[PDB]
Amino acid sequence: VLRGTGHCKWFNVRMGFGFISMINREGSPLDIPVDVFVHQSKLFMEGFRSLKEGEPVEFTFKKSSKGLESIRVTGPGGSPCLGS
Numbered sequence: 035v036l037r038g039t040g041h042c043k044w045f046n047v048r049m050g051f052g053f054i055s056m057i058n059r060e061g062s063p064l065d066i067p068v069d070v071f072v073h074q075s076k077l078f079m080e081g082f083r084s085l086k087e088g089e090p091v092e093f094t095f096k097k098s099s100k101g102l103e104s105i106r107v108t109g110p111g112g113s114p115c116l117g118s
Contacts, residue, residue, distance in 0.1 A: 037060060043055040051071065056069065070104050086116050
């Protein structure tokens, strides 16, 4: 279980998932961003779960055979995500 921070790259509510651009990993700025998969079920917020393109996020994630995958995604300071 690693942590990172960055921003929603895209999120498609019809698909129920999207990607986060990670720009900081384990507390270190990255020289090139790396994307992280995010499914609606992992979004920390009340009511309908989505992300808005560009919204800033903090998250835990893991490695898998299908790229990096988020475990739990919040807005800044662990606050709820905003969504679209």
